Tab-separated table of C-alpha atoms in Angstrom:
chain	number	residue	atom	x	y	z
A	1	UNK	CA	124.356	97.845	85.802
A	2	UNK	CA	121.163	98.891	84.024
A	3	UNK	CA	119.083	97.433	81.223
A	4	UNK	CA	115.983	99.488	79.115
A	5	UNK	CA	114.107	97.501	76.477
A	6	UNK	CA	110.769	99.027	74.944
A	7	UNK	CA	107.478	96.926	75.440
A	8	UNK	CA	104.787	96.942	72.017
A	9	UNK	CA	101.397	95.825	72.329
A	10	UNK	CA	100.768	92.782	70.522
A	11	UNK	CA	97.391	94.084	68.875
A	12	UNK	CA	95.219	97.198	68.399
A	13	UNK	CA	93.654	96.675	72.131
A	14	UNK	CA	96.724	95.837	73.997
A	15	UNK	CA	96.141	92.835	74.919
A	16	UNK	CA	99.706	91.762	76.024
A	17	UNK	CA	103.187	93.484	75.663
A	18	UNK	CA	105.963	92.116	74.406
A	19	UNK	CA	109.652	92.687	74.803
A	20	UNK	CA	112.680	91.606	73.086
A	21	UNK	CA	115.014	89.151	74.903
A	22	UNK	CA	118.013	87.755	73.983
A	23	UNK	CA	118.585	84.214	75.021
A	24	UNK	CA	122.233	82.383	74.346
A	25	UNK	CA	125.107	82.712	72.236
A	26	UNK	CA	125.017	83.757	69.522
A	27	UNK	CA	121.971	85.701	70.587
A	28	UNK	CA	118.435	84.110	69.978
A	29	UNK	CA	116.166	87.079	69.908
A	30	UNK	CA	112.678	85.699	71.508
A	31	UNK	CA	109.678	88.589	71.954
A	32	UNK	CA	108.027	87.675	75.714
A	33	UNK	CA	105.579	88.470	77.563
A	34	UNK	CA	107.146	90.398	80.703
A	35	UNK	CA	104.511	89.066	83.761
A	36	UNK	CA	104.531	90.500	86.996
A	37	UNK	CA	102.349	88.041	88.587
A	38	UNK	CA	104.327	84.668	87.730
A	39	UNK	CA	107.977	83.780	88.029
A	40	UNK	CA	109.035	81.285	85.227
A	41	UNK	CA	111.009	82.455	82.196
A	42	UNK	CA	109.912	79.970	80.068
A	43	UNK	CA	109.870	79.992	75.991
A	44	UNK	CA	108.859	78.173	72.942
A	45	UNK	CA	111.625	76.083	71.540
A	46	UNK	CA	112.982	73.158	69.666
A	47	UNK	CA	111.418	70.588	71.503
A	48	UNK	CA	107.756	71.991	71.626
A	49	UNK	CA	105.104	69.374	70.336
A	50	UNK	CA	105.371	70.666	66.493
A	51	UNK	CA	101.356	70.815	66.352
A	52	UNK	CA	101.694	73.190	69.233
A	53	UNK	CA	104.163	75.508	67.518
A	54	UNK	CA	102.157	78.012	65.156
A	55	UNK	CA	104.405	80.695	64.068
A	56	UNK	CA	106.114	81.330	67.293
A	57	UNK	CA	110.010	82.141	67.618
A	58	UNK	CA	111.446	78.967	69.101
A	59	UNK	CA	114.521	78.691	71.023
A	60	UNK	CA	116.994	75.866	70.478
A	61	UNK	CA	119.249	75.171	73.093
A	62	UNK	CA	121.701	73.131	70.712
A	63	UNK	CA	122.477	75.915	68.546
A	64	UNK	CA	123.378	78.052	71.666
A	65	UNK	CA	126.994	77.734	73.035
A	66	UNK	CA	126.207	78.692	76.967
A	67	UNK	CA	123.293	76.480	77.249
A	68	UNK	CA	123.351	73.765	79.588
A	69	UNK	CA	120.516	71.009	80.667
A	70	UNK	CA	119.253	71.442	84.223
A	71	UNK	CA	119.622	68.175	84.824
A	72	UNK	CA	116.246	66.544	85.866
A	73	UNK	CA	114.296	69.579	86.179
A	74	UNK	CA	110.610	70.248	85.013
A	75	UNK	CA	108.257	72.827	85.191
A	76	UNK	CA	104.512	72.911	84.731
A	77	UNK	CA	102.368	76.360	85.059
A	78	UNK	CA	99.040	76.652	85.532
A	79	UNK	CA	98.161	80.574	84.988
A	80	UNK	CA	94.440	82.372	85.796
A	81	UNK	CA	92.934	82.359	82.744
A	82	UNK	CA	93.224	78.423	82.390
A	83	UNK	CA	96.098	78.674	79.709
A	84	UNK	CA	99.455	76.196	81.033
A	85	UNK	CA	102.441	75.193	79.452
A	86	UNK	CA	105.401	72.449	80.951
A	87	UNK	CA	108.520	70.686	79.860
A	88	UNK	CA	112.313	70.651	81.170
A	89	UNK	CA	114.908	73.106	81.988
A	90	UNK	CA	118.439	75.075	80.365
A	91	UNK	CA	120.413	77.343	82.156
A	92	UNK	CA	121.832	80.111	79.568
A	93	UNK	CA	122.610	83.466	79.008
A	94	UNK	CA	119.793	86.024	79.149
A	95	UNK	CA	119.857	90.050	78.295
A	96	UNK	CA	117.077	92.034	78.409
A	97	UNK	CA	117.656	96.083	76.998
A	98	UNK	CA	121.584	95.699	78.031
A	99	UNK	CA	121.427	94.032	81.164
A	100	UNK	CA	122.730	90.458	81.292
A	101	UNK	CA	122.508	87.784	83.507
A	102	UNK	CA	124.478	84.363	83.153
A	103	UNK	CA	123.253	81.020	84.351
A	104	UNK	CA	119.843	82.381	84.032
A	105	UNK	CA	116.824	79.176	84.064
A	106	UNK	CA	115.110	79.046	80.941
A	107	UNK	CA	112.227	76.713	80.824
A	108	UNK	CA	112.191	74.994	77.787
A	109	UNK	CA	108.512	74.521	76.519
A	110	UNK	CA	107.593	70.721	75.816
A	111	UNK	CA	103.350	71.787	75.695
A	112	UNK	CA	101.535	74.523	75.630
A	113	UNK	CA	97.878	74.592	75.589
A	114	UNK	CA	95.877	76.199	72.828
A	115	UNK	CA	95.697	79.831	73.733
A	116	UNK	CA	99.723	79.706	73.657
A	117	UNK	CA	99.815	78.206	70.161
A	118	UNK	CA	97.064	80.457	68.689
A	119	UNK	CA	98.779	83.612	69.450
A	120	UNK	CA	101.798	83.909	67.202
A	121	UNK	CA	102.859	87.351	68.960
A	122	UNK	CA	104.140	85.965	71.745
A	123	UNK	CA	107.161	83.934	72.074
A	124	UNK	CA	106.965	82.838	76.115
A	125	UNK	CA	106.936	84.784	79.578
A	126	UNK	CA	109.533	86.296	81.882
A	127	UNK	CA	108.343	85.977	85.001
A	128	UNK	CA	108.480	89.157	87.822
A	129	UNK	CA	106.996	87.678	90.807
A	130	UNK	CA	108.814	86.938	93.493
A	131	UNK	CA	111.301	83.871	93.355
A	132	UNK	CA	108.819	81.706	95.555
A	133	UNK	CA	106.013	81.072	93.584
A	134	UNK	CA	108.385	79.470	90.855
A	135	UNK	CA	107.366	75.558	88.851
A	136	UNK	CA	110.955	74.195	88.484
A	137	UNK	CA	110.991	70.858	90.238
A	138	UNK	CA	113.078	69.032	92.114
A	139	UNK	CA	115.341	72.829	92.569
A	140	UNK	CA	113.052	76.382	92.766
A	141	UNK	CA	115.194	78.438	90.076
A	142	UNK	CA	115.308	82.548	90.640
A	143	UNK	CA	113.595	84.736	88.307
A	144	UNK	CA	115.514	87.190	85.835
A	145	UNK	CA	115.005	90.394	88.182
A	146	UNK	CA	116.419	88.028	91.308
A	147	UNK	CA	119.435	86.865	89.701
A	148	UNK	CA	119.862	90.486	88.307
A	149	UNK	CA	119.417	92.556	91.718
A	150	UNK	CA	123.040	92.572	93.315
A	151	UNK	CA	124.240	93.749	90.152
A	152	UNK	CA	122.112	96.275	89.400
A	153	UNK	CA	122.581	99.912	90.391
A	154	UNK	CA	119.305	100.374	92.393
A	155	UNK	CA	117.190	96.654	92.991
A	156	UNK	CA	114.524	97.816	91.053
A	157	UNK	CA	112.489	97.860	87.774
A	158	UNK	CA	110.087	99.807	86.357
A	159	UNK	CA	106.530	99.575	84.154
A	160	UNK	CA	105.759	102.184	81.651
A	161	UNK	CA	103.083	100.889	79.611
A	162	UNK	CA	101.359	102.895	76.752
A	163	UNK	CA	98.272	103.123	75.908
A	164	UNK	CA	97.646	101.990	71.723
A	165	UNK	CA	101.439	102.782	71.582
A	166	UNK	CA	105.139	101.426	72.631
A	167	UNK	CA	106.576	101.576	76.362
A	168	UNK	CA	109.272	101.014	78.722
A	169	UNK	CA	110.777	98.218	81.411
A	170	UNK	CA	113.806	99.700	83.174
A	171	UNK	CA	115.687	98.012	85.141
A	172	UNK	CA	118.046	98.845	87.898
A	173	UNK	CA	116.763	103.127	87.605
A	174	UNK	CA	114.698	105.366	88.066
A	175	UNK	CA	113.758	107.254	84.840
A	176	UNK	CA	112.868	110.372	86.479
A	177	UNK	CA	111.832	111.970	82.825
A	178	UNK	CA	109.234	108.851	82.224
A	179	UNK	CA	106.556	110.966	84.875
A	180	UNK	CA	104.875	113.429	86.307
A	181	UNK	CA	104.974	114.717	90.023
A	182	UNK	CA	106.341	112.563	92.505
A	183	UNK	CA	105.971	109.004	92.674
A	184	UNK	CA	103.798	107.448	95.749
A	185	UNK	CA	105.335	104.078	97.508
A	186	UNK	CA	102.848	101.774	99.373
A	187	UNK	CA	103.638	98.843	101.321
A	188	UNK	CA	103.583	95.278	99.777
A	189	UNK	CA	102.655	91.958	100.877
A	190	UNK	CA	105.258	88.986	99.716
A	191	UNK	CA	102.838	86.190	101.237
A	192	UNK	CA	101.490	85.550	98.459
A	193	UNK	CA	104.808	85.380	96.086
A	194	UNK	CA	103.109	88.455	94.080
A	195	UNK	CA	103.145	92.541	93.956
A	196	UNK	CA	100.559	92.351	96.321
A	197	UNK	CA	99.296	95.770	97.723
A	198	UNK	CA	96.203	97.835	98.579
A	199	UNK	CA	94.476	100.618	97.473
A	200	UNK	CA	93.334	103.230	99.008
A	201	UNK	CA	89.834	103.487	97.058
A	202	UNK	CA	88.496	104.494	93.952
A	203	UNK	CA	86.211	106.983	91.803
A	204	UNK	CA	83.889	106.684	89.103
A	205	UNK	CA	84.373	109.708	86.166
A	206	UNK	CA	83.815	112.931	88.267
A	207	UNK	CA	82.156	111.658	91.136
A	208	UNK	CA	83.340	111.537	94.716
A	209	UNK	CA	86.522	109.264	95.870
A	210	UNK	CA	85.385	106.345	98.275
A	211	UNK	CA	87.498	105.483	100.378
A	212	UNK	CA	87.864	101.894	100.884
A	213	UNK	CA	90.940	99.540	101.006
A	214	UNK	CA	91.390	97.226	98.173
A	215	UNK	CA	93.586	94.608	98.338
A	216	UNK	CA	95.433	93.153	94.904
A	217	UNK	CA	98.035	92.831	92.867
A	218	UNK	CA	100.436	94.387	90.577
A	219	UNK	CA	99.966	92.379	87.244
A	220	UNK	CA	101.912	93.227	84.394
A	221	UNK	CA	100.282	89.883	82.295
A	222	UNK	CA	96.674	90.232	83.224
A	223	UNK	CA	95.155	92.771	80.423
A	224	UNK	CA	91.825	94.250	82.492
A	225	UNK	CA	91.090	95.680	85.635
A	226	UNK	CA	89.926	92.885	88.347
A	227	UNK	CA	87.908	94.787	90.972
A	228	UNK	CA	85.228	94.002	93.744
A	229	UNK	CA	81.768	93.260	92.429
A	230	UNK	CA	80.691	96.429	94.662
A	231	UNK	CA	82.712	98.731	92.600
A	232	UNK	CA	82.440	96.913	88.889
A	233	UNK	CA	78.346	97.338	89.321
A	234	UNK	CA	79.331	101.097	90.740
A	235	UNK	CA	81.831	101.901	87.706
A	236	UNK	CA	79.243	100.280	84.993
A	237	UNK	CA	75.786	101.834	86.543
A	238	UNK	CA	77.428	104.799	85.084
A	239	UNK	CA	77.253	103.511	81.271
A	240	UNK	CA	73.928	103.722	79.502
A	241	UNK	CA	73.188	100.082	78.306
A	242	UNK	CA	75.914	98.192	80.562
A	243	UNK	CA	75.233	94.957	81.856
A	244	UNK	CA	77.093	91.925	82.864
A	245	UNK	CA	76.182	89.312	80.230
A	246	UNK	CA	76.924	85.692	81.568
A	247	UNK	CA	77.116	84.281	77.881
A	248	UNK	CA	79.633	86.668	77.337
A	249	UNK	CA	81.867	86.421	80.173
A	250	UNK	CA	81.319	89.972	81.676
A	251	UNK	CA	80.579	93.365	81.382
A	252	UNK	CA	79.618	94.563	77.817
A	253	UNK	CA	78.439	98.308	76.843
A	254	UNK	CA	77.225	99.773	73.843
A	255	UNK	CA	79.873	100.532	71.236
A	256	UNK	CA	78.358	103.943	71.059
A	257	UNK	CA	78.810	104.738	74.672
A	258	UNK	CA	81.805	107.305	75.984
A	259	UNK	CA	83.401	105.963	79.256
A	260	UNK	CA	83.890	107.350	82.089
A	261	UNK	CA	87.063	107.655	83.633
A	262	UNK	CA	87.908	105.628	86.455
A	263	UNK	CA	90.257	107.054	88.971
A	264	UNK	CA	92.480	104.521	92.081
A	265	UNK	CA	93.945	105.697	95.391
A	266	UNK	CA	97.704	105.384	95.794
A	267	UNK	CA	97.578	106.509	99.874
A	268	UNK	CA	97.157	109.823	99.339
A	269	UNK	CA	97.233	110.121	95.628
A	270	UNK	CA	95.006	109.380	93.195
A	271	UNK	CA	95.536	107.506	89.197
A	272	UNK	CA	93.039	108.251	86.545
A	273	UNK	CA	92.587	105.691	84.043
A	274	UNK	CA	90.749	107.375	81.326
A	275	UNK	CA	87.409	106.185	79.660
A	276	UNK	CA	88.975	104.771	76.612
A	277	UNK	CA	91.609	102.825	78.208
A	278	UNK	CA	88.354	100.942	79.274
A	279	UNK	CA	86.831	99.989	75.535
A	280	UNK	CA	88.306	96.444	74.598
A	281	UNK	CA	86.140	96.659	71.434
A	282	UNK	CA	83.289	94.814	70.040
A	283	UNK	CA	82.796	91.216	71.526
A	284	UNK	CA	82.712	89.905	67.824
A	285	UNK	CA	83.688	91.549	64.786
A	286	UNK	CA	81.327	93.679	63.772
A	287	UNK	CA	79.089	93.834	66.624
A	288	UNK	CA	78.115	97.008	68.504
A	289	UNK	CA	78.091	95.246	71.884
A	290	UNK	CA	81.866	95.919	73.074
A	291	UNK	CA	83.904	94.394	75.811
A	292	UNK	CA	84.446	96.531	78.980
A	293	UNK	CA	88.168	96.864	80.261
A	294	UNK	CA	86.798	96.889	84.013
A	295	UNK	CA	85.182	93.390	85.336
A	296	UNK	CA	84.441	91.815	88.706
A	297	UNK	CA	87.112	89.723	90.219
A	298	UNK	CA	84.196	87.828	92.471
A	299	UNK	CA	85.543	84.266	91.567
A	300	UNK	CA	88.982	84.942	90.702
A	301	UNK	CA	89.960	84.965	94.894
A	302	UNK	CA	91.667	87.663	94.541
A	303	UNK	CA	91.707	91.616	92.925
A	304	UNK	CA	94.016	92.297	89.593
A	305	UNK	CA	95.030	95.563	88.656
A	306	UNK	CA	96.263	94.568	85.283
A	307	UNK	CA	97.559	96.420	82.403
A	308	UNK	CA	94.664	98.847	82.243
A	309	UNK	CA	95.576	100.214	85.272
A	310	UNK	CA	99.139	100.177	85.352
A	311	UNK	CA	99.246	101.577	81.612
A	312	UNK	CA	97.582	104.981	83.152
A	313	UNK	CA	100.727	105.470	85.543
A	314	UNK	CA	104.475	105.078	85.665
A	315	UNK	CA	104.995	101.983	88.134
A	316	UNK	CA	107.843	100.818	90.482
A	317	UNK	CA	108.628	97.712	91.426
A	318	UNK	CA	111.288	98.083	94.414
A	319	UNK	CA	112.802	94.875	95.449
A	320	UNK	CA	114.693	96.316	98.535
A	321	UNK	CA	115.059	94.012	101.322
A	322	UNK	CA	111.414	94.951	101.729
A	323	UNK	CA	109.810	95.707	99.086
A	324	UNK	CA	107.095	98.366	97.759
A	325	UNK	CA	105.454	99.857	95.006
A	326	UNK	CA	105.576	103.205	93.460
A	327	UNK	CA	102.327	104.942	91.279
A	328	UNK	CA	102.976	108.306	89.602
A	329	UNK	CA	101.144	109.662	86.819
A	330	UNK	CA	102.520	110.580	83.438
């Protein structure tokens, strides 16, 4: 089996993606945020805290004729940016873009903490880490992709994110129309439970590649670029008027500044994330101080190559027996 669903920013800066899933029967259409570095499927639903609930799409398990309580199970999430959510468990019927898994955990949302509420767009998260790093208590559940492989074609999915415009998750093939060239696999590190890999180096607009080995992940759910402090200052030095601003929370630039690209090592090949992909916009409406897409990861413990990177290529995420990555340009 396959499935294809197209993923739509959720604002003009891309922010997040989200992706049409249909949960139960008869289908309950909920628009998620497809993560790559978490592995709960978990959604807003009937038995969120009502104050918490702010235009969402909810899911109600009653109304759904496969869904059954996982009895005594709970979940609690805790993700990077300091947003969580928690409450109990369903098992139910899931399809994403044609593909359809039964018995599939869906974590039923009892709270959600204010960054959840506030953004309407976003209806919950399907998790594509690996299996491991799951919150259900007393029993781990599998993520979607996990309980998918055996039946898919190929044990794989695919990233094609757009830049200010619509894009794909595949799953199960290889859309060998979505890219350009050939694709480049590199090794990946499961320790962890993420997509955890490392580069080969990076560039800064035209000038010279530096080799150096980055280590980080694959993060479909993190919006900006998480890199070394080295190569932040390195990337930024080249921006007239840049300058990490601690009030702000990062690097900011002047709204009247063009970018440089900013190019990553694949082994031997090479992604170019171009300038713009690197304007997140003015800090405040109306400012002309705007937020840069590339910041330091010096804090975070660990390097993020988040949806402006992996919008500039076409990205594979091989779950063979051990798995890789694949980069190719588009």
């Amino acid at each position: 089996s396959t499935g294809s669903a197209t993923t739509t920013p959720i604002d003009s800066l891309d922010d997040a993606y989200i992706t049409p899933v249909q949960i139960g029967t008869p289908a309950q259409t909920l628009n998620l945020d497809f993560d790559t570095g978490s592995s709960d499927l978990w959604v807003f639903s009937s038995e969120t805290t009502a104050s918490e609930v702010d235009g969402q799409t909810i899911y109600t398990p009653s109304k759904s004729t496969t869904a059954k309580l996982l009895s005594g199970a709970t979940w609690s999430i805790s993700y990077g940016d300091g947003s969580s959510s928690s409450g109990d468990v369903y098992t139910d019927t899931v399809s994403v873009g044609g593909l359809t898994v039964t018995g599939q955990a869906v974590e039923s949302a009892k709270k959600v903490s204010s960054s959840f509420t506030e953004d309407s767009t976003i209806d919950g998260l399907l998790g594509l880490a690996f299996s491991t790093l799951n919150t259900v208590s007393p029993t781990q559940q599998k993520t979607f992709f996990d309980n998918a492989k055996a039946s898919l074609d190929s044990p794989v999915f695919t990233a094609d994110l757009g830049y200010h415009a619509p894009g794909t998750y595949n799953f199960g093939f290889i859309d060998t129309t979505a890219y350009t060239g050939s694709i480049t696999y590199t090794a990946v590190s499961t320790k962890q439970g993420f997509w955890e890999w490392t580069s080969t180096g990076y560039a800064v607009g035209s000038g010279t590649f530096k080799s150096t080995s980055i280590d980080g992940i694959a993060d479909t759910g993190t919006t900006l670029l998480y890199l070394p402090a080295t190569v932040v200052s390195a990337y930024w030095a080249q921006v007239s008027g840049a300058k990490s601003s601690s009030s702000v929370g990062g690097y900011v630039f002047p709204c009247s500044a063009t970018l440089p690209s900013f190019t990553f090592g694949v082994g031997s090949a090479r992604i170019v994330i171009p300038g713009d992909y690197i304007d997140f916009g003015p800090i405040s409406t109306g400012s002309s101080s705007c937020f840069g897409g590339i910041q330091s990861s010096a804090g975070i413990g660990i390097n993020i190559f988040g949806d402006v990177a992996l919008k500039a290529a076409f990205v594979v995420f091989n779950g063979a027996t051990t798995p890789t990555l694949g980069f190719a340009s588009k």
